[PDB]
Amino acid sequence: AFEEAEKNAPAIIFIDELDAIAPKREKTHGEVERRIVSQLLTLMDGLKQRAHVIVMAATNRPNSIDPALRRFGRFDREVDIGIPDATGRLEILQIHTKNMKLADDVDLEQVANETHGHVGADLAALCSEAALQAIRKKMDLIDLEDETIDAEVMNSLAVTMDDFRWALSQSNPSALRETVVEVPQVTWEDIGGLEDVKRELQELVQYPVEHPDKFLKFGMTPSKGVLFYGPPGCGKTLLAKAIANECQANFISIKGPELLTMWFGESEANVREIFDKARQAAPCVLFFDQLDSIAKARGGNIGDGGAADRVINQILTEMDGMSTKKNVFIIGATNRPDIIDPAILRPGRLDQLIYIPLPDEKSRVAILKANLRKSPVAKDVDLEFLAKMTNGFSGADLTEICQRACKLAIRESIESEIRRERERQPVPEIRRDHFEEAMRFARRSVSD
Amino acid sequence: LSTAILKQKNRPNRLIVDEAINEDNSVVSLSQPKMDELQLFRGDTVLLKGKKRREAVCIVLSDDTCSDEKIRMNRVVRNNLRVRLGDVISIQPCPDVKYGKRIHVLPIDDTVEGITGNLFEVYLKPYFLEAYRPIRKGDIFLVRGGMRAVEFKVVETDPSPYCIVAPDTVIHCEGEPIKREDEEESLNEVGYDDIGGCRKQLAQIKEMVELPLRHPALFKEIGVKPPRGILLYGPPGTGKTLIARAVANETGAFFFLINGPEIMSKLAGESESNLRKAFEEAEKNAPAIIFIDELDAIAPKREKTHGEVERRIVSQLLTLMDGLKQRAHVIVMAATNRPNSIDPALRRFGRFDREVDIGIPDATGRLEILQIHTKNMKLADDVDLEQVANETHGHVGADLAALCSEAALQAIRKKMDLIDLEDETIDAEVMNSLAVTMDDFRWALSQSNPSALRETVVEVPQVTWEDIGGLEDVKRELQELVQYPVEHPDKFLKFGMTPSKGVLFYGPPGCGKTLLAKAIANECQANFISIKGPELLTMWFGESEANVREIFDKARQAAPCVLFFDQLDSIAKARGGNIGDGGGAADRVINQILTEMDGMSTKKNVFIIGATNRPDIIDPAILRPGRLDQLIYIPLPDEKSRVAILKANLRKSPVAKDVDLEFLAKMTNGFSGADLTEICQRACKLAIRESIESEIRRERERQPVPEIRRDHFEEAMRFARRSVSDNDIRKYEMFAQTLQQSRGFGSFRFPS
Amino acid sequence: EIGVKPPRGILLYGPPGTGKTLIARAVANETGAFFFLINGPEIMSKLAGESESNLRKAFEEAEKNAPAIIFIDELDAIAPKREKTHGEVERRIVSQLLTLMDGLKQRAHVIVMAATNRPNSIDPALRRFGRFDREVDIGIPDATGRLEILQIHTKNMKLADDVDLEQVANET
Ligand SMILES: Nc1ncnc2c1ncn2[C@@H]1O[C@H](COP(=O)(O)OP(=O)(O)OP(=O)(O)O)[C@@H](O)[C@H]1O
Ligand SMILES: Nc1ncnc2c1ncn2[C@@H]1O[C@H](COP(=O)(O)OP(=O)(O)OP(=O)(O)O)[C@@H](O)[C@H]1O
Ligand SMILES: Nc1ncnc2c1ncn2[C@@H]1O[C@H](COP(=O)(O)OP(=O)(O)OP(=O)(O)O)[C@@H](O)[C@H]1O
Ligand SMILES: Nc1ncnc2c1ncn2[C@@H]1O[C@H](COP(=O)(O)OP(=O)(O)O)[C@@H](O)[C@H]1O
Ligand SMILES: [Mg+2]
Ligand SMILES: [Mg+2]
Ligand SMILES: [Mg+2]
């Protein structure tokens, strides 16, 4: 190959997937692979110099390449093709859609703003999905078994803004296809009370993203750390569920002990991988449910050996180390914050500690209303009195009262149907007496 | 809009297949209004298209008794198009059909075995004599004559593929006879009709596969390239390979199969060479479809794999799928159980563009799967597939196929008793007597278990709700907890609330906590997983929490499932109990359990039941509503319940009428349920002792106890003792007292 | 006529020495089928691609010698769980076995039997219908069962009048 290139000089050689044939000779056991690396080293820079031949290469993992292949005279320059920003992905969309035919209502600015962590491949996938949706819209005209499509349907075929909206709804970064979970679709209306906490959560993600120039003028960097601590059942995980839907940033959900592994150094490698995955998809929200499982004070356990204490040390460097901060927002929910390592709780890592207490009388009315928004309930039932009696009840306790009332209503409804079927051979809404019977089984989950 | 492509569009050519009256192998009948609508004339030749890209040519006729939407054709025409009664085919004119010059036909072996006469004169000449029958390459037609009707296969026609058998057309039958196995395999092919419960998945797969090939002008007009990579993932037995087979059979494109490990070779560079050769064969015969089965074996993550050969193979596949030389007419499909093990660079645009989840079917989908599976089988009238579909909760398509096979073998088992089985052949009358009965399906249902949960299977002692004495209120709640969300999902949607799915049983030992779980394991209509407390603990660093995820994930796939934790206090603890407890793994297991019950994931019909003996040490987060909301206290039985326990234990045993259970329960004030059982077992032992000495005495003289008597119970009582002490009782009454006092003021009442 | 296909998979699990191999040999001998034996450890190969090549060769030879019975000793060693197996060779062996038992090409007139001490160690995919779909437990012999075993083993030997095999069965 090199002789053919030198024969027809000037020439360019492109080696796709360089890491496939150029691993480190120190870490390679196979003799053939090491001999190939040595041959590449000699050909690309050796005693007989190249006759004006340019060599190009592409690799996902530059750090797997042999160190001798990176010095000048041998892959002189390294060029970083990185994730585009909003303007870059707008340019990519404009380039992509020049061939495509689009309706007049399409707005590429909104599509560019909505796609946060997407790369050119992701934008191409979005365009293809939108076009497929347009074809689906024109499906009821055409027949699959027809020999050809009608000319009028072909002319009417175009990509509208609704197709792009649907594609955006289905769109997700290819880096984020493993760390994907199905969120139960909670909105800010589903949460009762916590109005001050709601405002802080929205502003924390919205301000750095929608108003980056405001921070530049005032000259201060944004704050991107939150810890939720409080009694069980008070809305810590609901706030994360609402963020997973309503907030305009990527979301990664981490169960606590997921990252831990049998092997010696893989537990900390999982921490590095999940933090690097969040940096690629910035702006991204990294949520740690049950943070006390992972972030526990060092020195507590004599024998783990030291893997538990080593994992938290990796998080400390990831959250705040010698690297430029990105738009990665880390939120943690803990039930017992007294055991969290004090290094985690310092400002710059988890600076904002928000305490979510038991709901008060005003909040309990809001919680009761939020549960009953989509439920048919008799007008007789007054939520103001019900919240007054339940004093130390949590948000989960109030929901359990409503669920048990529904079960009593369903039990009566089923019995009536059996009764009517029996005599042959009701309960439109939850009534006042259903809530009274459900209240006798109610109890305070969190003790004094 | 997702299933728009599946939604069939009414066309004048679409006709329902109907039974023939006088139609032979070469004619079909259409109603006069439909013929006039289609502008068809009597005597015209038409082109018939069926399933699995099967085509047939026949002569269209008129029939006043045929429906407008129906077409009449005999069994031969139906078999040629691989269609059955009620199916839909398309009829179109077939002009420019020329007279046949030379046709080659070959007979089927099973219709010729024992026939040694001249096939031509006996069968083919009278069949084609002055008939001008239209024939096509590959049709199978049956001809009467001789000693037995003989089927023939058309292997070559001139012109091809359509010709008219003219009087001067040369008909010859010399050649290798057709094999029965090949014909049976061709008859039994997988199509899109064989997949059930995957309607949206089939819609997506058709959109990527068939739509670009049938109508590429649409994609050219809209100016986009359709996706060329499909990844199918799901648990084993969901039908990924079945869908691949259906796509291979139903498509008019070159199909190549790549099993995962078969690519591997010991010689350097030969695995990548095999991949390159496969892909080159794909573009050589374009358009083409490449299917890679068990992709996780061939394409692991390059970062986490140590072998250089695996990395080089992943890189080669990566370059083949998306490289500098773009591929245009090739579509690559892959199937794997675990998609997350695949290299991330392979899950991208240009490499496996779309991912399709072939999940566990629901009741409606599994009913369709049963209907598809049992169409070939013989079923009696009493058999109803809806009940079998409802009673198979966690079953997947492979599980349903296993159930059908087991039911069929049970059906044979019944005929096994009648015959000696040593006969050289089975009698024809017994053969016709055999059919699949609903009893066989019930026996299979009893034997059937989902393949997902074969590790977590235990032999329950078959306890019934009648075996439990007392606990009437507890029984009703337990039945309603599983039955209500499963049998009445629409009621919860109407009221708009999710069900409650948590129960904790606590009380003194021997009061019926584990007995209730045994009754649920049998009576309740949901999958059951039994978990011993410390069963999930491992000395390795992260495996203890990994076992928690697996058991909770196993219950989600088999929903509705009941997850029972016996001795919950072993894995559930208040946390922070000790400075060092296995390096903090005990506290870390609780945190994993907390997220599984209530975390950032959609809730399924998974019911968690925990029986604890001491509930004061359990983590308060676990007892929170949404995890174990309903706490039920199982106390020592009172006088009324103790009478019920005595009858439940003594129901099977033959006991004399003179014994009084009411007095027996009155004196045993503080006994448990297990204490009362020990008294009855002790009475049996004394009766067995008296019976054994009596029969020994009778044998001794040569060389009694029909029922348990009062003296047996009286002697048994002197050994009886109260296992649960008074001090232990106050401990359980204390925890229950806190729960009642935590509620606040009693007798809640709305004002006015 | 009943319109079903018989199961093609057998999994025998029990303590070592219980007689699973002898049951397989008896089945293959009395029925007109060729007995082909596969040992799990000997399939293992350090070279990449050799092990599943050996599996393919074994299956093709069994197909050639139809009717045949394929017996695999220690299926747990050859085929562990893929998610818990760090080794690539064993995982590829499991995948090859899965494809050999079930795929686009359906094997016909071939019965695969396996013997393992621990059935739960096998990959859950290998327990699916169509591939070791039925599992048979060969438990520790009973008193009358071990008496019958003694009678079978002592039929060729000469036995005195004093000896009682039932006493030997009871003491064992
Ligand atoms: N403010 C609230 N408004 C409405 N529902 C609420 C609220 N707080 C809690 N809930 C209810 O609580 C349940 C979920 O509680 P959540 O997951 O938020 O608890 P948590 O504080 O994270 O507790 P844990 O420590 O157990 O994780 C749901 O039934 C939800 O409706
Ligand atoms: N949706 C379905 N409709 C009808 N039959 C089905 C369906 N799903 C599975 N089956 C039946 O179950 C079997 C499917 O096995 P198949 O090889 O397709 O499964 P798989 O999920 O691809 O396998 P694995 O993941 O173990 O490689 C066949 O016998 C098929 O008849
Ligand atoms: N209500 C009852 N009716 C019939 N038998 C009962 C009843 N309660 C207990 N028993 C008997 O008690 C014995 C064991 O009871 P079980 O296993 O249900 O106790 P448990 O509450 O789980 O106790 P432990 O705390 O010791 O695990 C069995 O023989 C069972 O038949
Ligand atoms: N049920 C049995 N009846 C008679 N002999 C048996 C039985 N089970 C085991 N054996 C004896 O065990 C010996 C071989 O054991 P083997 O079947 O190889 O053990 P495994 O089942 O572990 O492969 C044979 O010599 C045979 O006589
Ligand atoms: Mg939570
Ligand atoms: Mg498969
Ligand atoms: Mg118990």
Three-state helix/strand/coil letters over A8-73: CCCEEEEEECHHHHCCCCCCCCCHHHHHHHHHHHHHHCCCCCCCCEEEEEECCCHHHCCHHHCCCC
CA contacts within 13 A on the Cβ side of C128: 22
Q: Is 1.10.8.60 the CATH number for B363-447? A: yes
Which residue in A296, A298, A301, A288 sits closest to A256, CA to CA? A288
Which ligand is closest to the CA of B624, given by its number? 1
- Chain B, residues 296-325, CB within 8 A of chain A, namely 302-303, 308, 311-312, 315-316, 318-319, 323-324
**CATH numeric code, B4-93:** 2.40.40.20
Yes or no, beta carbons of C129 and B455 under 8 Å apart: no
Which residues does ligand 4 sit against, CB inside 6 Å? C 16-22, 149, 152
Nearest to C129 among B399, B409, B431 (CB): B399
- Chain B, residues 329-358, CB within 8 A of chain C, namely 337-338
**CATH numeric code, B102-187:** 3.10.330.10
**CATH numeric code, A188-355:** 3.40.50.300
Q: DSSP state, B506? A: E
CA contacts within 13 A on the Cβ side of C101: 23
**E strands, B165-305, where?**
170-172, 229-233, 254-259, 288-293
Sequence-ordered list of residues with C-beta below 8 angstroms from that of A433, at least 6 positions apart, any chain: none
Instruction: Report in angstroms the alpha-carbon separations of B437 from A129, B399, B444, B664.
Output: 49, 19, 11, 49
Task: For the beta carbon of residue B301, count every other beta carbon within 10 angstroms.
Answer: 16
Nearest to B500 among A140, A403, A442 (CB): A403
Is C47 in CB contact (< 8 Å) with chain B? yes
- Contact list, A265 vs chain B (CB under 8 Å): none
Mutation for testing the B interface, residue in A31, A63, A64, A128 having most B CBs under 10 Å: A128
Domain boundaries, chain B: 4-93, 102-187, 192-357, 363-447, 465-633, 639-728
Nearest to C49 among B265, B296, B412 (CB): B265
Q: What is the dihedral of CA B204, B210, B212, B217, to 10 degrees?
A: -130
- Contact list, B378 vs chain C (CB under 8 Å): 1-3
Is A360 in CB contact (< 8 Å) with chain B? no
> Which structure tokens are listed for A135?
């074809």
Is C25 in CB contact (< 8 Å) with chain B? no
Per residue, what are the HEC states of A342-387? HHHHCCCCCCEEEECCCCCHHHHHHHHHHHCCCCCECCCCCHHHHH
- Please work out whether the CB of residue C98 comes within 6 Å of at least one atom of ligand 2: yes
| CATH number of B465-633, picked from 3.30.930.10, 3.30.360.10, 3.40.50.300, 3.90.180.10 | 3.40.50.300
CA of A236 to the centre of ligand 5 (A): 6
Q: Nearest 5°: phi and psi at B253?
A: -135, 155
Q: Nearest 5°: phi and psi at A98?
A: -70, -35
Nearest to B377 among C4, C7, C88 (CB): C4
Is C84 in CB contact (< 8 Å) with chain B? no
- How would CATH label the architecture of B192-357? 3-Layer(aba) Sandwich (3.40)
CA of B337 to the centre of ligand 6 (A): 8
- Chain C, residues 87-146, CB within 8 A of chain B, namely 88, 91-93, 95-96, 98-99, 102-105, 119-120, 124-125, 127-130, 133, 135
**E strands, B22-114, where?**
27-30, 45-49, 55-62, 70-73, 88-93, 102-107
**Rama region for B713: left / alpha / beta (φ>0; ψ in -120 to 50; rest):** alpha
Mutation for testing the A interface, residue in B313, B589, B748 having most A CBs under 10 Å: B748
> Which structure tokens are listed for A371?
């549960």
Calpha distance B623→B645 (Å, rounded): 30
Which ligand is closest to the CA of B507, given by its number? 3
Resolution (A): 3.0
Q: Which atom of ligand 4 is nearest the CA belonging to C23?
A: 17
Omega into B161 within 30° of 0, i.e. cis?
Answer: yes
CA of B514 to the centre of ligand 7 (A): 4
- Please work out whether the CB of residue B645 comes within 6 Å of at least one atom of ligand 3: yes
Calpha distance A181→B600 (Å, rounded): 8
CA of B217 to the centre of ligand 1 (A): 53
**E strands, A256-314, where?**
284-289
Is A233 in CB contact (< 8 Å) with chain B? yes
Q: Nearest 5°: phi and psi at B7?
A: -65, 110
User: Which chains, if any, share at least 3 CB pairs under 8 A with chain C?
Assistant: B
CA of B455 to the centre of ligand 3 (A): 27
Report whether A370 contacts A192 (CB < 8 A). Answer: yes
Calpha distance B619→B593 (Å, rounded): 11
Calpha distance C116→C71 (Å, rounded): 11
Containing H/E element for B212?
Answer: helix B199-214
Report whether B524 contacts B485 (CB < 8 A). Answer: no
User: Which chains, if any, share at least 3 CB pairs under 8 A with chain B?
Assistant: A, C
Q: DSSP state, B570? A: G
User: Which chains, if any, share at least 3 CB pairs under 8 A with chain A?
Assistant: B
- Please work out whether the CB of residue B673 comes within 6 Å of at least one atom of ligand 3: yes
Q: Which atom of ligand 3 is nearest the CA belonging to B505?
A: 21
**CATH numeric code, A361-448:** 6.10.20.150
Which residue in B563, B555, B557, B504 sits closest to B531, CA to CA? B563
Q: Which atom of ligand 3 is nearest the CA belonging to B468?
A: 3
Yes or no, beta carbons of C129 and B451 under 8 Å apart: yes
Is B188 in CB contact (< 8 Å) with chain C? no
> Which structure tokens are listed for C144?
């009358």
Burial of A114 (0-12, 13-18, 19+ CB in 10 A): middle
**E strands, B307-396, where?**
330-336, 354-357
Q: Parallel, antiparallel, or unpaired: how do β-strands B150-158 and B140-143 relate?
A: antiparallel
Which residue in A387, A390, A374 sits closest to A429, CA to CA? A374
Q: Which fold has domain B639-728?
A: Arc Repressor Mutant, subunit A (6.10.20)
Report whether B337 contacts B236 (CB < 8 A). Answer: yes
Nearest to C3 among B266, B293, B376 (CB): B376
Q: Is 3.40.50.20 the CATH number for A86-176? A: no
CA of B613 to the centre of ligand 7 (A): 8
Q: Compute and round to an integer the Cα radius of gyration of chain B.
A: 35
> Which structure tokens are listed for B733?
């009454």
Is B538 in CB contact (< 8 Å) with chain C? no
Equal CATH topology for B192-357 and B465-633 = yes
Calpha distance A258→B546 (Å, rounded): 8
- Please work out whether the CB of residue B236 comes within 6 Å of at least one atom of ligand 2: yes
At B674, the amino acid letter reads A
Which residue in C2, C1, C6, C3 sits closest to C129, CA to CA? C6
Instruction: Report in angstroms the alpha-carbon separations of B116 from A384, B111, B112, B155, B171.
Output: 96, 11, 8, 21, 18
Burial of A139 (0-12, 13-18, 19+ CB in 10 A): buried
Interhelix angle B585-597/B543-557, nearest 10 degrees: 20
Sequence-ordered list of residues with C-beta below 8 angstroms from that of B186, at least 6 positions apart, any chain: none
Placement of tokens 């019909």 in the chain: B605
B142-179: buried (b, 16+ CB within 10 Å) or exposed (e) per residue?
bbebeeeebbbbbeebeeeebbbbeeebeeebeeeebe
- Please work out whether the CB of residue B511 comes within 6 Å of at least one atom of ligand 3: yes
Q: Compute and round to an integer the Cα radius of gyration of chain A.
A: 30
Residue of B514, B569, B722 with the most ligand 3 atoms within 8 Å of its CB, for mutation: B514
CATH superfamily label, C1-137: P-loop containing nucleotide triphosphate hydrolases (3.40.50.300)
